[PDB]
Design an enzyme around this catalytic site. Structure first.
Site, PDB file in Angstrom:
ATOM      1  N   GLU A   1      53.344  22.155  67.227  1.00 51.43           N
ATOM      2  CA  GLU A   1      53.052  22.931  66.014  1.00 51.43           C
ATOM      3  C   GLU A   1      54.269  23.715  65.553  1.00 51.43           C
ATOM      4  OE1 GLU A   1      50.595  22.741  64.105  1.00 51.43           O
ATOM      5  OE2 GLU A   1      48.898  21.973  65.273  1.00 51.43           O
TER       6      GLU A   1
ATOM      7  N   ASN B   1      50.815  24.401  53.220  1.00 55.77           N
ATOM      8  CA  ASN B   1      49.859  23.283  53.165  1.00 55.77           C
ATOM      9  C   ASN B   1      49.644  22.818  51.746  1.00 55.77           C
ATOM     10  OD1 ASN B   1      49.381  23.456  55.926  1.00 55.77           O
ATOM     11  ND2 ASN B   1      48.111  25.266  55.591  1.00 55.77           N
TER      12      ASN B   1
ATOM     13  N   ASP C   1      47.119  22.627  49.891  1.00 60.18           N
ATOM     14  CA  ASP C   1      46.200  23.446  49.115  1.00 60.18           C
ATOM     15  C   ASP C   1      46.721  24.844  48.761  1.00 60.18           C
ATOM     16  OD1 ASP C   1      46.067  24.768  51.518  1.00 60.18           O
ATOM     17  OD2 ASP C   1      43.903  24.567  51.768  1.00 60.18           O
TER      18      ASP C   1
ATOM     19  N   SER D   1      47.655  27.106  51.004  1.00 61.84           N
ATOM     20  CA  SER D   1      47.622  27.948  52.198  1.00 61.84           C
ATOM     21  C   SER D   1      48.903  27.772  53.022  1.00 61.84           C
ATOM     22  CB  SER D   1      46.389  27.659  53.015  1.00 61.84           C
ATOM     23  OG  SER D   1      46.419  26.356  53.539  1.00 61.84           O
TER      24      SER D   1
ATOM     25  N   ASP E   1      50.541  28.009  57.160  1.00 67.74           N
ATOM     26  CA  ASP E   1      50.342  28.069  58.616  1.00 67.74           C
ATOM     27  C   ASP E   1      51.410  29.001  59.217  1.00 67.74           C
ATOM     28  OD1 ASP E   1      48.373  26.100  58.425  1.00 67.74           O
ATOM     29  OD2 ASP E   1      49.648  24.506  59.302  1.00 67.74           O
TER      30      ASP E   1
ATOM     31  N   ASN F   1      46.247  28.928  60.057  1.00 69.15           N
ATOM     32  CA  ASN F   1      46.167  28.799  58.603  1.00 69.15           C
ATOM     33  C   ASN F   1      45.571  30.028  57.907  1.00 69.15           C
ATOM     34  OD1 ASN F   1      46.124  27.678  56.030  1.00 69.15           O
ATOM     35  ND2 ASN F   1      44.897  25.876  56.594  1.00 69.15           N
TER      36      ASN F   1
HETATM   37 HO   LIG Z   1      49.990  22.349  59.815  1.00 64.94          HO
END
Ligand SMILES: [Ho]
Ligand SMILES: [Cl-]
Ligand SMILES: [Cl-]
Ligand SMILES: [Cl-]
Ligand SMILES: [Ho]
Ligand SMILES: [Ho]
Ligand code: NA
EC number: 3.2.1.17
Length: 129
Positions: free
Chosen positions: A35, A46, A48, A50, A52, A59
């Site tokens: 990650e 992201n 959309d 958002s 992370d 998120n």
């Molecule tokens: Ho991600």
């Protein structure tokens, strides 16, 4: 902060993540590796809108507040910036909620795709635990 492998394993263990909801420490270290490459300051946008945050790429769509994810929730009740700290407490406490949401560690797509079913104990080999 960029953690070393065993350093992160030890910190995660101290914060009670080892075998939390049945997921051995190697699972968590593996997830963090893919990650964030063990970097607490990692962020990624992201599709959309958002974002992370942190070692486990939590998120803003559901888990933390960043003030720019219109329509989202803050279920961990934290500013997303807390997830970037050198102190992993916030990331760990929020991860514990996430992994309890129903789908276990499948919530981390990188865990599902790169750690699940693999020899995850390799990730804590050599560490003093
Ligand atoms: Ho991600
Ligand atoms: Cl393990
Ligand atoms: Cl927001
Ligand atoms: Cl599970
Ligand atoms: Ho959920
Ligand atoms: Ho131990
Ligand atoms: Na949010």
């Amino acid at each position: 902060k960029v953690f070393g492998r065993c350093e992160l394993a030890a910190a995660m263990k101290r914060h009670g993540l080892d075998n939390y909801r049945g997921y051995s420490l190697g699972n968590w270290v593996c997830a963090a590796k893919f990650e964030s490459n063990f970097n607490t300051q990692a962020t990624n946008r992201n599709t959309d809108g958002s974002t992370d945050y942190g070692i486990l790429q939590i998120n803003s769509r559901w888990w933390c507040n960043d003030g720019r994810t219109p329509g989202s929730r803050n279920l961990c009740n934290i500013p997303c910036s807390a997830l970037l700290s050198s102190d992993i407490t916030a990331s760990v406490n929020c991860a514990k909620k996430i992994v309890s949401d129903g789908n276990g560690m499948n919530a981390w797509v990188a865990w599902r795709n790169r750690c699940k079913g693999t020899d995850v104990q390799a990730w804590i080999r050599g560490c003093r635990l």
